[PDB]
Design an enzyme around this catalytic site. Structure first.
Site, PDB file in Angstrom:
ATOM      1  N   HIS B 202       0.758  -1.316   0.009  1.00 59.07           N
ATOM      2  CA  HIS B 202      -0.263   0.084  -0.257  1.00 59.07           C
ATOM      3  C   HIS B 202       1.002   1.167  -0.216  1.00 59.07           C
ATOM      4  CE1 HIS B 202      -4.168   0.861   0.329  1.00 59.07           C
ATOM      5  NE2 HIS B 202      -4.065   1.836   1.157  1.00 59.07           N
ATOM      6  N   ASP B 229     -13.875  -6.930 -10.896  1.00 60.26           N
ATOM      7  CA  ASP B 229     -13.698  -8.344 -10.286  1.00 60.26           C
ATOM      8  C   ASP B 229     -14.820  -9.362 -10.271  1.00 60.26           C
ATOM      9  OD1 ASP B 229     -10.803  -7.805  -9.531  1.00 60.26           O
ATOM     10  OD2 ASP B 229     -11.338  -7.046  -7.460  1.00 60.26           O
TER      11      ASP B 229
END
Ligand code: CDL
Ligand code: CDL
Ligand code: PC1
Ligand code: PC1
Ligand code: PTY
Ligand code: HEC
Ligand code: HEC
Ligand code: HEM
Ligand code: HEM
Ligand code: HEM
Ligand code: HEM
Lengths: 244, 383, 85, 54, 244, 383
Positions: B202, B229
């Protein structure tokens, strides 16, 4: 390895249950139970199958209770703690021909006949292997093959020499539905029955699979529309650049 | 300030699944991460459910799995879902790793998520190996025997370690019961490491297929990648459905339907398909200890990609020679897989050794050479 | 409501000088005997009622209940037990 | 004291080595000491005390 | 509840093993095994104890192997699969007097004698309860007590009426070490033995506990010094405030 | 910049265990949080180890626990450590909750860590209840029977839910195997919630015994509270040692050394000591459903402390009347515990009802009244 060491590969036969949407033929399953009971059960157990399992697949509740009630099973000890027997119930498992491995081997020239409850999943080929093996005993072994004593030639069996002799011959069984009991017919029925014994969820599973396929496919189609809908502002974006 | 940002717990979720800034051009190979999370959730749900019906004692284990198949409502589904999802987990993990290698996801500043990733891959292998033993069929027993005997190669203490792992002098009840406890635990450890590699990522964010910064052009994770997704989730579920409902035993070995028998040895003892390339690498080295080292090195060598890749550019999208080399590397990895399940016979013995050399020479020679030359071609070619 | 070092969220501090000495320069057990006796006595004396009153009350309640229950299940308590049920 | 500090304490590598070596010694000596003390306080009671009769 | 419904609480006897640093007396354990074997084992099993467990506690390897070898145990079937017996080995468990519960109850007027392997942990009181019960059968039940048929009065047993009669009487056993086998002596020895059977780690556990106590106490002392050392700059801090 | 601050993974650890700014005046009651973490680690280590030797099948469960005691090296220690640490876990959690109630840790801005804390307490109860069943002794079976039958009180569907929980028509093998799988899982869930309540706390930091801000005077968590935690760790380990090595069965019930027998019911069925106050509350209400509601409410009512405490001041250090009321509340909670294990006989029936009323009236009447009056006494008294 040589082809002999592998065993000859069985043909792909067109079983009724082959086919995404196809169940077993239950009339064949019932006939196959009768072959099991009258031929195979002399040497082979079916220990994972209980009488209740036949009910509504091959037999009615009453027929299966009748089969169970003809046998004796070990009960709990009586009040003096002495052993007792009871008649069979639907919850009981189908009893095997031998009390232990040693007795099984003694009756079969040292060979141990496997339990047949999972045999269709435990061998490459499944039903086709069982059918090919049972129907594939040549009258004479290929010239040059030396069988060990108590072995029989069968090309489907790896190495060629199997301890089980041919057992299916035209008319060893008299089917209760009037079907001609030829070697081929009996092998087909018993191979179907054993396939059912290995995978008794088969029919339900494939129907649930059809429902899943339909729903999941529709969801896939809709998910494509929705993704395209949501992404269109990004895909359609345009730029004008005026260098500062 | 919006609650999703103000509340510290909500803000953690927000930072990963909602406001998370993503490159706007991730292609479908960026969807394997969410498929891996899906496989992990399926394995936890089906695995915990199988644990409610399974018995780890060697006298009852194989029969408890038959009881699941035959008597437990939908037990056949839960069992086949768990068994097939183990294979799908490895297809998705190989795709995710291949994405990472092709696009240079291991390069700075993403060395740390890649390195923790290599450990995730090792934990998945251990998890899957122990779970396969739990069936206690012939392949379960004999695979445990041969794989655990590789530890005997450790000098001096190797034999002692093996007896210690088995809890006895061969694979038996103690080994099965401990494999159950560890097989239950290892997926939780794996989930923690999966979370660690995401937190490490991240700091840089996702890389993207062009290999450039995305700081110039970000999209929120939701709704764009949420809905993208879903497409691959439903594609995965369609493949899942075809195996679980229509061909539940295609990916398995029939010998695992025979109860473990320490006397009779099966014709061929092979690992599950996803471990086959590592097994081929081990066979290539004639020495026992040599083979074990090579097999472990084949995984740990992934840790040096950040060093041996000398490119000034991230990823292969614009590097024709690197793309060819990558193609050969991948196909060689599949051939090693195939050679892991052939018999130890001519001419596959030598072929396995050549493929093993090619596998290692990718990391040690070819990628450093090709990446050096391509740097020079980009510079000279664009002058 | 809490920041971090350098911006903890204190109102501005000014005018306080703080002093201390190294752990190696100090006697860690300085004044321990006085503390252990007199300080503990002071701290305990000042909290004693808040422990003694509820503990003593609930112990008395228990003692009375347990003694009655014991008596009811003797021969002598037959009649009183019959009424109580 | 300076010498002792300089050799065993100043470098943490030396300090940790000394601590671990002492732990090894303590472990072996403490084992032997407890075993003997345990045998004295439970004298005549343990199998080792009656074993000779059999 | 009435005191009778609870049972009389046993005295606290001074067992050798009472005492943080005390082991069992192994001579008493050996004598207690002999009482078990010659009296209790007629009705009570000790199923959790194997012959190997006696070795180096109460008996040598040879004595225990001799006890095992005198018995017959079920072997694996022979080659025709017929049942066989073998002599006992150290790995074998001590065999019980009855084949099942029903046989046990039939021999004891309906009552089931419990297995004694965990009895010292499975009853409040432990050794003291076993000793009190065995030695606490009054010659005559207190006036007014009506015993159910096949029951014996024992105040330690809850409700008073136990299906086990008194079994220990002076000289029912002849100890091999010359100890006078009085009721009290035999009850003490067998209660010790049964306590060992329930918790055979007892001696090792308490010695390891002594080592743990010593190490942990020293670590507690040192942790106090270290905490005070590290905290002294905070505790000793002083302030001078000059209001701005 | 120091690595511990720069690297995102290290910085997370750093923020919780090293640079974490703490009040400089935490007393020893702030040490129960680290003891709870210790208990959780011991239970995971001992629990996973027992899982390597335990068999969840009802025909083998009780004997597998005897095998652990008798045959497994140090099995007696691992078993007794696991069993006694379950009790120590509850002593520490009651101390930690009592600290929180006395010092006003539930007040703003710490409502969220407190509320997640109440769920942690519920998960601990469920975890411990399922683990106790796994022994499959008499108390295991009969405690499962009585407690699971309380679900039958749920209107309409209760009976169906019970059969569904049991996986049959009584507590038996299916129930034992499912309790094993869930008992293994629940500690991992409990660890996640324990982490959540700490992350929620980190926004305000620890409260302190004076109830004032500590933003004026902070100390690093390490080394000060690390070394202060070691004192209570060693004090805990000394208590652990005395039970585990010298009195391992003091906290247990002898009937759990008798194998479960569905026919014979033991003399008295009580829960483990730490559940006894809730059991007394349940007995106090004559109605089955009433009693179950009361018992659950006795835990969920902790969620309203943030509302019913009307004080303008945090915590009891300076509130003499609140301190007396707190003393009576705690002692009443212990008396409820005692009444949970007496026989349902006079005069304990009525006493249990009075103690139950006092328990609830603390939250609903007394704390709101006392806290209102004390607000006025502080104001008038200091004018
Ligand atoms: C298993 C679980 C099920 C889930 C399935 C998920 C798989 C989806 C995925 O990652 O692949 C789809 C993926 C489509 O993804 P995309 O985001 O449109 O483009 C990704 C490529 O980088 C874009 O590549 P490109 O734009 O250069 O297009 C190349 C592609 C054409 O790609 C197209 O789809 C057109 O055609 C080929 O490479 C075929 C090779 C020639 C063979 C003859 O298919 C490929 O392009 C596969 C090529 C791999 C070789
Ligand atoms: C379980 C696992 C084992 C691990 C043990 C952990 C226990 C440590 C703990 O939290 O308590 C120690 C704890 C000592 O902690 P501290 O940090 O010195 O003082 C905390 C209070 O502010 C101390 O309150 P204070 O300064 O007002 O002093 C009062 C204290 C005297 O406190 C002591 O220093 C002792 O004595 C009493 O309140 C005794 C009650 C009177 C009965 C007669 O002892 C008590 O506070 C006991 C009083 C509780 C009622
Ligand atoms: C089999 C051999 C595969 C070689 C791939 C060569 C590139 C190609 O044509 O791919 C299409 C595409 C090309 O995409 P691209 O991102 O390079 O280019 C997009 C289009 N342009 C250049 C105009 C911007 O490649 C991929 O998408 C590659 C992902 C690799 C995944 C590999 C999985 C293997 C698992 C084994 C693990 C060890
Ligand atoms: C039993 C009754 C205990 C009541 C305590 C009353 C206060 C007291 O004297 O304690 C000393 C001390 C007083 O500490 P204090 O912080 O109020 O005062 C320190 C000293 N002065 C006032 C000078 C600043 O109280 C504690 O430390 C209380 C912690 C409570 C823990 C209770 C655990 C019970 C578990 C039941 C769970 C439900
Ligand atoms: C899990 C439960 C944790 C609590 C442990 C307490 C005692 C357990 C130790 C086992 C034991 O009986 O050890 C005794 C010594 O105790 C001791 O001296 C041990 C007390 C030490 C307390 C804690 C110190 C660190 C322990 C935890 C660290 C573990 C992981 C870190 C690498 C004697 O046994 P023995 O001396 O015969 O043993 C052989 C070596 N001679
Ligand atoms: C009187 C003996 C006997 C009868 C009748 C018998 N078998 Fe067998 N069977 C054996 C023995 C012995 C083997 C073991 C052969 C070997 O492994 O060498 C065996 C093996 C098999 C195998 C496994 C071969 C393999 O791949 O391992 C199948 C499948 C089989 N039998 C099915 C049947 C079916 C179906 C029937 C009858 C309808 C049948 N058997 C009748 C004795 C018998
Ligand atoms: C011939 C029968 C018989 C002999 C001999 C015998 N017992 Fe028992 N015992 C029983 C029976 C029957 C019970 C069950 C009594 C009941 O529950 O009412 C029993 C119960 C017990 C109990 C449990 C009482 C309880 O609390 O449940 C203990 C302990 C006991 N016996 C120990 C011994 C010991 C020690 C010996 C001998 C040294 C011994 N027994 C000899 C028949 C016998
Ligand atoms: C990454 C997650 C996991 C993977 C890759 C995995 C993999 C496997 C594999 C390969 C098997 C052998 C399956 C078979 O052929 O029958 C298996 C069996 C099993 N797994 Fe897992 N597993 C995972 C998670 C879990 C979890 C979390 C549990 C919880 C206990 C679990 C419980 C089981 C059980 C009980 C079996 C034996 C029954 C059976 O074979 O189906 N698994 N697992
Ligand atoms: C349980 C297994 C795993 C899960 C659930 C998982 C999940 C994810 C997710 C969700 C992402 C972000 C989205 C994406 O790029 O696909 C990601 C990125 C990444 N993963 Fe994994 N992963 C797993 C295993 C691995 C392994 C084995 C590796 C490496 C050997 C790896 C290396 C990485 C890297 C380097 C990235 C950053 C890629 C980039 O965006 O450029 N992961 N992972
Ligand atoms: C918060 C954590 C835990 C608590 C409070 C807890 C509590 C308990 C309790 C009270 C028992 C009954 C003990 C007895 O009397 O014998 C038990 C048994 C057991 N626990 Fe746990 N446990 C925890 C964690 C775990 C974990 C993580 C495992 C991993 C499998 C586990 C495995 C077991 C096993 C196998 C048993 C049965 C064997 C035995 O009774 O000792 N426990 N647990
Ligand atoms: C597994 C169980 C638990 C663990 C490991 C745990 C751990 C901790 C730790 C380490 C802290 C910070 C240090 C301290 O104040 O002691 C803390 C604070 C706190 N915990 Fe827990 N805890 C647990 C259960 C609970 C429960 C059941 C509650 C509430 C019902 C709770 C409520 C709190 C609150 C409110 C705080 C902040 C107190 C303050 O510092 O003022 N915790 N916990």
């Amino acid at each position: 390895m040589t082809a002999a060491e592998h065993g000859l590969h069985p043909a792909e036969y067109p079983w009724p249950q082959n086919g995404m949407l196809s169940t077993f033929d239950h009339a064949s399953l019932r006939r196959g139970y009768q072959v099991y009971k009258e031929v195979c059960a002399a040497c082979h157990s079916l220990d994972r199958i209980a009488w209740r399992n036949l009910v509504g697949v091959t037999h009615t509740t009453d027929e299966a209770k009748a089969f169970a009630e003809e046998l004796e099973y070990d009960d709990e000890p009586d009040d003096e703690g002495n052993p007792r027997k009871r008649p069979g119930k639907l919850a009981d498992y189908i009893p095997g021909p031998y009390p232990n491995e040693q007795a099984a081997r003694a009756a079969n020239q040292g060979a141990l006949p496997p339990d047949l409850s999972l045999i269709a999943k435990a061998r490459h080929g499944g039903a086709d292997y069982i059918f090919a093996l049972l129907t594939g005993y040549p009258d004479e072994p290929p010239a040059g093959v030396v069988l060990a004593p108590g072995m029989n030639y069968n090309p489907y069996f790896p190495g060629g020499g199997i301890g089980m002799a041919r057992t299916l011959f035209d008319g060893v069984v008299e089917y209760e539905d009037g079907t001609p009991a030829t070697t081929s017919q009996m092998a087909k029925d018993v191979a179907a029955f054993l396939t059912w014994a290995a995978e008794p969820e088969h029919d339900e599973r494939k129907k649930l699979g059809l429902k899943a396929i339909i729903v999941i496919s529709a969801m896939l189609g809709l998910s494509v529309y929705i993704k395209k809908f949501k992404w269109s502002p990004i895909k359609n974006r345009k730029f004008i650049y005026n260098p500062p | 300030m919006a609650l999703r940002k103000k509340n510290s717990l909500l803000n953690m979720a927000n930072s990963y699944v909602l406001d998370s800034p993503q490159p706007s051009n991730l292609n479908y190979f960026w969807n394997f991460g969410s498929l891996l999370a899906l496989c992990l959730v399926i394995q936890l749900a089906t695995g915990i459910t199988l644990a409610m019906h399974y018995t780890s004692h060697a006298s009852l284990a194989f029969d408890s799995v038959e009881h699941i198949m035959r008597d437990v409502n939908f037990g056949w589904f839960i069992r086949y879902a768990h068994a097939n999802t183990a294979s799908f987990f490895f297809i998705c993990i190989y795709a995710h790793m291949g994405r990472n290698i092709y696009y240079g996801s291991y390069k700075t500043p993403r060395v740390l998520p890649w390195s923790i990733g290599v450990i995730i891959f090792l934990l998945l292998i251990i998890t899957a190996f122990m779970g396969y033993v739990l069936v206690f069929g012939q392949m379960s027993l004999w695979g445990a025997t041969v794989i655990c005997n590789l530890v005997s190669a450790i000098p001096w203490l190797g034999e002692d370690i093996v007896h210690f792992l088995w809890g006895g002098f061969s694979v038996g009840n103690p080994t099965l019961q401990r494999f159950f406890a560890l097989h239950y635990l290892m997926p939780f450890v794996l989930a923690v490491f999966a979370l660690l590699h995401l937190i490490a990522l991240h700091t840089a964010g996702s890389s993207n297929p062009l290999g450039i910064t995305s700081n110039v052009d970000k999209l929120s994770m939701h709704p764009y990648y949420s809905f993208k997704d879903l497409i691959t989730v439903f594609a995965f579920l369609l493949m899942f459905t075809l195996f679980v409902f229509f061909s539940p035993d295609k990916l398995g070995h029939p010998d695992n339907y025979i109860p473990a028998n320490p006397m009779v040895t099966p014709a061929s003892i092979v690992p599950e398909w996803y471990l086959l390339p590592f097994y081929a690498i081990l066979r290539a080295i004639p020495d026992k200890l040599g083979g074990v080292i090579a097999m472990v090195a084949a995984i740990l060598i992934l840790l040096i990609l950040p060093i041996v890749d000398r490119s000034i550019i991230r990823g292969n999208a614009f590097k024709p020679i690197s793309k060819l080399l990558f193609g050969f590397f991948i196909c060689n990895f599949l051939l090693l897989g195939v050679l892991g399940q052939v018999h130890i016979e001519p001419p596959f013995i030598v072929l396995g050794q050549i493929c093993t050399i090619f596998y290692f020479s990718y990391f040690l020679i070819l990628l450093p050479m090709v990446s050096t030359i391509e740097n020079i071609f980009f510079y000279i070619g664009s002058l | 409501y809490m920041g971090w070092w350098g911006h903890m969220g204190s109102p501005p501090q000014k005018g306080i000088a703080g002093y201390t000495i190294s752990p190696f320069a100090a006697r860690p057990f300085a004044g321990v005997v006085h503390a252990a006796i007199f300080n503990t006595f002071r701290r305990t004396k000042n909290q004693a009622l808040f422990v003694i009153l509820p503990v003593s009350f609930f112990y008395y309640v228990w003692t009375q209940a347990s003694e009655k229950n014991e008596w009811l299940y003797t021969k002598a308590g037959r009649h009183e037990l019959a009424k109580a049920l | 004291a300076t010498t002792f500090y300089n050799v065993f304490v100043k470098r943490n590598s030396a300090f940790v080595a000394t601590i671990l070596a002492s732990a090894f010694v303590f472990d072996m000596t403490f084992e032997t000491a407890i075993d003997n003390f345990w045998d004295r306080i439970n004298a005549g009671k343990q199998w080792k005390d009656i074993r000779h009769k059999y």
